[PDB]
């Protein structure tokens, strides 16, 4: 069965230079392999943690991430103004991957852009597009990510730098995950499009971290916005 993560708070209130540990908890044992993701206000998401305690590139050491079997955490010391911000983990242990619902912080050349969401009725149709630039990117794995209006992020699929294919349950036959290695360009083809699709919908890189098939999504577009109702 699917791996559910569980982040207990969903905003934690501090001052500035405090000190705050953000929990997070596994369903089952995910073998350390567990991602942070930084969401701004603005909605700018980035990868914070991986691999349960390794920091990406351009994160400071303010930020210690800790745990093992199920329980896992982010310490964030002397907290800063841009701390300010959502914070999600992610289990990369098992297909599919799977997010916490994250924790909102409150006080007291790599490039992603998407293109083609917009408004359609239930059965409708759209092509999302995501153009790379600044890495060689026939020789990464890329995903699509999608936010919805409730914040929940959710894996949508995966491509492999070859065109292996992986869908989440929910979408399979559904959508349709593909790439030009060529032009440098993600697809994901929606087809019969329901009202929970309604999301915005990123396109991310995916980086190897650990063999045979664990990645952290170290860049995030943008997004592009998929809208389904009736109305």
């Known amino acids: 069965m699917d791996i559910q993560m569980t982040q207990t708070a969903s905003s934690l209130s501090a001052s500035l230079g405090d000190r705050v540990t953000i929990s997070c908890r596994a369903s089952?044992?995910?073998?350390?392999?567990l991602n942070w993701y930084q969401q701004k206000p603005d909605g700018t998401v980035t990868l914070l943690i991986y691999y349960t305690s390794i920091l990406h590139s351009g994160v400071p050491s303010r930020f210690i991430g800790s745990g093992s079997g199920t329980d896992y955490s982010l310490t964030i010391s002397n907290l800063d103004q841009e701390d300010i911000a959502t914070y999600f983990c992610?289990?990369?242990?098992?297909?599919?991957?799977?997010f916490g619902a994250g924790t909102k912080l409150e006080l007291k050349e790599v490039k992603l852009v998407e293109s083609g969401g917009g408004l359609v009725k239930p059965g409708g149709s759209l092509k999302l597009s995501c153009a790379a630039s600044?890495?060689?990117?026939?020789?990464?794995?890329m995903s699509w990510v999608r936010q919805t209006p409730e914040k929940r992020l959710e894996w949508v699929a995966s491509?492999?730098?070859?065109?292996?294919?992986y869908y989440t349950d929910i979408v399979k036959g559904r959508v349709t995950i593909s790439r030009d290695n060529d032009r440098n360009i993600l697809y994901l083809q929606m087809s019969s499009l329901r009202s929970e699709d309604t999301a915005m919908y990123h396109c991310?890189?995916?980086?190897?971290?650990?063999?045979?098939?664990?990645?952290?999504?170290?860049?995030w577009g943008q997004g592009t916005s998929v809208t389904v109702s009736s109305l």
């Open positions: 992610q289990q990369g242990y098992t297909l599919p991957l799977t």
């Open positions: 491509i492999s730098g070859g065109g292996d294919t």
């Open positions: 991310t890189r995916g980086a190897l971290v650990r063999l045979p098939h664990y990645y952290s999504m170290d860049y």
């Open positions: 089952q044992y995910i073998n350390n392999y």
């Open positions: 600044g890495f060689t990117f026939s020789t990464y794995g």
